[PDB]
Amino acid sequence: NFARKVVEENKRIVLFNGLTTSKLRNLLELINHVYTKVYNSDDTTLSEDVRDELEYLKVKFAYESGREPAVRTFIEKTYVDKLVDVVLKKNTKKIFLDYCKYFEALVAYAKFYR
Amino acid sequence: FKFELSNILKGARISVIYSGGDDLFLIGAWDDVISKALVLRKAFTRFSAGKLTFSAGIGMYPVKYPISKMASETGVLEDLAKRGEKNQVALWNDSKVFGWSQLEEQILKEKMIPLQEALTNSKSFLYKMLELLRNEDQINIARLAYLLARSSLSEELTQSIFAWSQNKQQKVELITAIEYLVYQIRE
Amino acid sequence: LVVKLVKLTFKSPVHFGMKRLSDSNHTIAADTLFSALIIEALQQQLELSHLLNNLVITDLFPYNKTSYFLPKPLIRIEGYKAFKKLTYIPVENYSEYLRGEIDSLEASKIAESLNLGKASLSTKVSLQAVDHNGESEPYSVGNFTFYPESGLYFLAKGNADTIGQLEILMHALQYSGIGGKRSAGYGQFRCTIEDSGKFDSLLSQTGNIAILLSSAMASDEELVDCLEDARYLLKKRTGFVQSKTYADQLVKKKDFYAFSAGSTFYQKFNGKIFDVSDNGRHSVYRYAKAFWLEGKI
Amino acid sequence: MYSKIRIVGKIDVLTGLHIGGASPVVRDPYSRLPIIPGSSIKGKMRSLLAKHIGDAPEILRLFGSSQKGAIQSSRLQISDAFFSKASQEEFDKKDLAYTETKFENTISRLTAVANPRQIERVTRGASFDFHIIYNVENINEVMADFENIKTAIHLLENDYLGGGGTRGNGRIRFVIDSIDTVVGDFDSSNLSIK
Amino acid sequence: YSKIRIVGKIDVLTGLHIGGGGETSMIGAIASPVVRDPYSRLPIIPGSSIKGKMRSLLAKHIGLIPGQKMHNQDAPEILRLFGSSQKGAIQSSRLQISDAFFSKASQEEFDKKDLAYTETKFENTISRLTAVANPRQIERVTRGASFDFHIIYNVENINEVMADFENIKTAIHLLENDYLGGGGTRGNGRIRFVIDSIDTVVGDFDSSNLSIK
Amino acid sequence: YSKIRIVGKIDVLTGLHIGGGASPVVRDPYSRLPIIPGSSIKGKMRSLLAKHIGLIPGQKMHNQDAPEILRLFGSSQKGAIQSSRLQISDAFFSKASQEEFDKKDLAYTETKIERVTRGASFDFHIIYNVENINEVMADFENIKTAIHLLENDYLGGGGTRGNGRIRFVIDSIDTVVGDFDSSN
RNA sequence: UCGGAAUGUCGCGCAUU
RNA sequence: ACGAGAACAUGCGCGACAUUCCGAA
Numbered sequence A: 001n002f003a004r005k006v007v008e009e010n011k012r013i014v015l016f017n018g019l020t021t022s023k024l025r026n027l028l029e030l031i032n033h034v035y036t037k038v039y040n041s042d043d044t045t046l047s048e049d050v051r052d053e054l055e056y057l058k059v060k061f062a063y064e065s066g067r068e069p070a071v072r073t074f075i076e077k078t079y080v081d082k083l084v085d086v087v088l089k090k091n092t093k094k095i096f097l098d099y100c101k102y103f104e105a106l107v108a109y110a111k112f113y114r
Numbered sequence B: 001f002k003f004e005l006s007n008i009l010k011g012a013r014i015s016v017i018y019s020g021g022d023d024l025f026l027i028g029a030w031d032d033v034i035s036k037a038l039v040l041r042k043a044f045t046r047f048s049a050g051k052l053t054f055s056a057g058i059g060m061y062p063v064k065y066p067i068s069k070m071a072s073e074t075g076v077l078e079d080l081a082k083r084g085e086k087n088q089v090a091l092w093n094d095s096k097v098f099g100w101s102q103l104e105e106q107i108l109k110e111k112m113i114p115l116q117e118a119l120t121n122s123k124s125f126l127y128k129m130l131e132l133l134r135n136e137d138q139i140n141i142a143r144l145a146y147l148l149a150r151s152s153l154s155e156e157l158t159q160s161i162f163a164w165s166q167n168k169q170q171k172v173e174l175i176t177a178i179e180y181l182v183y184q185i186r187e
Numbered sequence C: 001l002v003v004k005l006v007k008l009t010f011k012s013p014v015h016f017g018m019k020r021l022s023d024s025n026h027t028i029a030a031d032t033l034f035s036a037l038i039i040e041a042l043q044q045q046l047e048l049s050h051l052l053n054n055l056v057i058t059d060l061f062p063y064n065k066t067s068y069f070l071p072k073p074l075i076r077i078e079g080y081k082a083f084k085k086l087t088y089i090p091v092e093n094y095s096e097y098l099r100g101e102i103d104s105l106e107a108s109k110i111a112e113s114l115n116l117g118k119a120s121l122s123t124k125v126s127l128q129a130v131d132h133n134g135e136s137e138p139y140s141v142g143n144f145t146f147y148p149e150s151g152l153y154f155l156a157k158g159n160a161d162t163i164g165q166l167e168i169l170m171h172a173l174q175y176s177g178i179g180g181k182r183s184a185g186y187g188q189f190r191c192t193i194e195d196s197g198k199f200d201s202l203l204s205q206t207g208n209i210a211i212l213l214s215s216a217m218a219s220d221e222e223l224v225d226c227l228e229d230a231r232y233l234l235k236k237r238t239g240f241v242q243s244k245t246y247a248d249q250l251v252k253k254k255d256f257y258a259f260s261a262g263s264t265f266y267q268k269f270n271g272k273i274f275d276v277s278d279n280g281r282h283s284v285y286r287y288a289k290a291f292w293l294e295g296k297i
Numbered sequence D: 001m002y003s004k005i006r007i008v009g010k011i012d013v014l015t016g017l018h019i020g021g022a023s024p025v026v027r028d029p030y031s032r033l034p035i036i037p038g039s040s041i042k043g044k045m046r047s048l049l050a051k052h053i054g055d056a057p058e059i060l061r062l063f064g065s066s067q068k069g070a071i072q073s074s075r076l077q078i079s080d081a082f083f084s085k086a087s088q089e090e091f092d093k094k095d096l097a098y099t100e101t102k103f104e105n106t107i108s109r110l111t112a113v114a115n116p117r118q119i120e121r122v123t124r125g126a127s128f129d130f131h132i133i134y135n136v137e138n139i140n141e142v143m144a145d146f147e148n149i150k151t152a153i154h155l156l157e158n159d160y161l162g163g164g165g166t167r168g169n170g171r172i173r174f175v176i177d178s179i180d181t182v183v184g185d186f187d188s189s190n191l192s193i194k
Numbered sequence E: 001y002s003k004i005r006i007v008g009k010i011d012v013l014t015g016l017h018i019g020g021g022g023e024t025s026m027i028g029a030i031a032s033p034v035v036r037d038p039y040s041r042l043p044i045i046p047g048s049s050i051k052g053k054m055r056s057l058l059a060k061h062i063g064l065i066p067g068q069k070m071h072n073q074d075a076p077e078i079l080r081l082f083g084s085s086q087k088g089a090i091q092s093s094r095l096q097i098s099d100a101f102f103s104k105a106s107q108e109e110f111d112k113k114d115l116a117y118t119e120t121k122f123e124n125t126i127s128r129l130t131a132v133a134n135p136r137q138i139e140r141v142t143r144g145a146s147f148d149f150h151i152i153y154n155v156e157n158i159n160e161v162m163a164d165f166e167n168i169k170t171a172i173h174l175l176e177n178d179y180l181g182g183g184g185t186r187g188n189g190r191i192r193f194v195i196d197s198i199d200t201v202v203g204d205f206d207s208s209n210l211s212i213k
Numbered sequence F: 001y002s003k004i005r006i007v008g009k010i011d012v013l014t015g016l017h018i019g020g021g022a023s024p025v026v027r028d029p030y031s032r033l034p035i036i037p038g039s040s041i042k043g044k045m046r047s048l049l050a051k052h053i054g055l056i057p058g059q060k061m062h063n064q065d066a067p068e069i070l071r072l073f074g075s076s077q078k079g080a081i082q083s084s085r086l087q088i089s090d091a092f093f094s095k096a097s098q099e100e101f102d103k104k105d106l107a108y109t110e111t112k113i114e115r116v117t118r119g120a121s122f123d124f125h126i127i128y129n130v131e132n133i134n135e136v137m138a139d140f141e142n143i144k145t146a147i148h149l150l151e152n153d154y155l156g157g158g159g160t161r162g163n164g165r166i167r168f169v170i171d172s173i174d175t176v177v178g179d180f181d182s183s184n
Numbered sequence G: 001u002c003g004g005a006a007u008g009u010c011g012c013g014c015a016u017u
Numbered sequence H: 001a002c003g004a005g006a007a008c009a010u011g012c013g014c015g016a017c018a019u020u021c022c023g024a025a
């Protein structure tokens, strides 16, 4: 429910200082990539390759912050970088599936409120 | 019951098996049966000037279904509608027990008609909405939001559907309306 | 007389029918259980007459967790539609319902508290004809999927030897299966037989009224005295003979009319194992011995 | 005296199993778990054994009969197969749905259009615990009856259960956990299935 | 009763794509996920797809009744092999092609080389007057994947077994050159059938003389 | 029903780019070699054949083409669906071209945009389905015209900027199944 | 880097019921 | 001597057809 609140608070239609699906695709592709990587595997804790590619997703988050200010404000407001941090801390499948679900809810609410 | 049922039921694909007193057994097309049940509730409120309510059980069974089973299930639904304040109709399965005003306005007029007109303006989409709604997961609500974004309908109506799904006891009415619409559009 | 209680937890959905295959019922009468027991005794090569004369069983009754159910007494209520629709009373409340103090909403709550099973109708097809240039035919079979903590219980009142015979018979009947489709996956159950203190104390009570617990029918002489001032429901029991030796083709049993469980009589009567077979190679036994519960009205 | 032999085991659905009743499978009406009706197993085994042995006295002796002058009690009481608890936990993990919706088409021979159909099938990993009772009536005829039962099981393992298994949906495999004479003193140690 | 079991591996040649809804890989990206067995989340060729493609190809090869309306009007060989459902003329199908699951060998070899069992092929459509390109993503099973395919043939007529297996030869050949399910006209679904064993598991029919390829 | 299979070697005059998401050229996940998608070839021949012949002013549904191209490359019109007589297969990296590349210090692809370096060959494989005996040859001439056009034009990428042109040579023309004559 | 992000069609039918 | 007893919710069916990862720089 936090995603809907964040999307509503950032409404202006301009969302997240101009963030669009075309700006989101570059990173959300990697997010769903690692999502399929975990979904194929069957293990309670994260696989090491998943951890490494999640770190790569985090640095790609920073790079997308550098690329466009809209993506940067999206990440700082939705804490998605902090979310990949905390799931890396937890290193469990349930939390990281929850984080992918969180990002899905974020993009779904962003699309709905446009 | 004996006489005015012919006038009230006029214009429906319905055969009245029996009225005979306080009760009523009715067989017809499912949609015509539901519509005439609502019209009957309104006409009975007009006849008795309030002061009297009747509960109903409405069932949807195929033909060559055991008539004993059909009547027994309809009576079971009627009994399910009896419990409580007795001013209820049990539509199809026992989970869908609604007040007469709730079924007439909240389910059909407010939800079924706008959804049907939206679908006509633009079936499987209703099916995936049902799949997302019947599950209690919050991310199923998120996926419903994404689907309503993708539906290319009037966005005011998609926000209305979001509001209906969010509210408890309004999601059930929305589900019943969608099931009614799906049964309306088949082959 | 030993009065052991037998508890039956059904592994599979069980098909009971009063009139039709598609029809589903949650319990059966004492007679239907007796017919199973008699078939099992004949299969097990046990003695028939001992079980016929000594055993006095009751109708199978619903039971869930923390409650045993008995048939609703057909007692005049000194808010009646709730009583009329009510069918089974918890044992701890049973004497209560006999004294009074039970109101309409409490009876409705008792009826709702019946957490025994869930009726359903499974549809199947017959392909015995499609091979012979034909077509399949669908048929519906009703059944009752009992809840995990629920099932059917019944008391039995006989001698020690009779109770041991019943123990062996029900041990075989666990795998024999009770129901109208016991050979097609339905009716499988497991039973546990033990003495229940609450039922012993309830039957120890000797009130002014007698309540039937089994589908029973008095002999004519006893029916002369027992029918006075009686409140009862007279159920029609009919069926088809189930045996490889009765006749070449299955024929209907003679129609029987027995008092339903819960019927209240001011004069007790010992029932009878009636014969409902005509021109058959063996005598079909329909159980109508009366299992009585005394209460104060 | 009269003997009942219990055969309890597992049915591993090697393919999606669709036993109809879109196009939903049959399920336990209370727990909504997928189930295999005992009538389904009994009918499939009877049809396969009739095809293999060709009603015949063996078929009627096994599965029962109602013909005039030949009323035979059904020796095989094939109880309903239930979704086993082991497979239930195996599917509670990985967050896997017990059933699945399979989309299929049908290209017409004239207009080359397809009609999509969504059939429900039990997922491959599922296991249904089955429990069948053989009613030993003739001690002499037990051996041949169990040979025919084994033949029917072998044919069914090379066949499908309910549904359009000619299109692949319904292949199963039996795993006999144990065979024990629950009733009577008959010797079932040498008796086996598969 | 005799059943002739054929077990082997169907090897993908060009990316094999059998469509179907479900839990989509790359959620929100692809518009045509491949059908995956939910238990293993592995790509799988449904046996219904193989059977339908083989039946269509064999019907086309043998000959199509002019203005055919239903499948049960096919040639008697087609009805005898893949089954018939004419009202009062039902013939049980002899071919019982199961779902071709993902093989363990191709599982381990794709675990090596870091393969993902699938590729999200990018394609697009170009209009004829506006020249606007509309993109699309379709999932495909990588060509190195091989599926363990397993079919059963029921022997109901001893005399017609040779003709039935000759027709199965023709159907298998046609399917080998033709594409399996998906947009194989654009190169999505070329397959090759490799046969490991054709043995009579149940019965006594002599299957040594029988070859489907 | 007859299938005529033609296997040939596309030879790349100038570096070609059909990369999916400039972007890296589309590579086979299995062999890790550059691969020419079949759909790209089929679309290019269909578009060139359509533009070569006269066209209706507006082709909104992409299905209103000339009847010959329509029967060659299929239909989608409601109730008049024609199966495509031509099936195009994915032309993967040739074994001979690969070995020639390992012979020198030459990579399969270059950076210019990842472009498959010129001089490579792809083993393309085409199937024609025989539906009308009297039409097979007429369809083949349209395929040849298309091939000829695809020799003059490009295949994907920045073709108008000078990358992606190829030449078609056919190793063999044979019917892989059916009684139709291959040498015809 | 900028755009297009899938689109057009069927969407269960046919035996018994 | 269980409103019983015998009975596969089954038979046929490709998630398929048309589609340039491209327009230019």
Ligand SMILES: [Mg+2]
Pocket: B022, B023
């Ligand atoms: Mg009334």
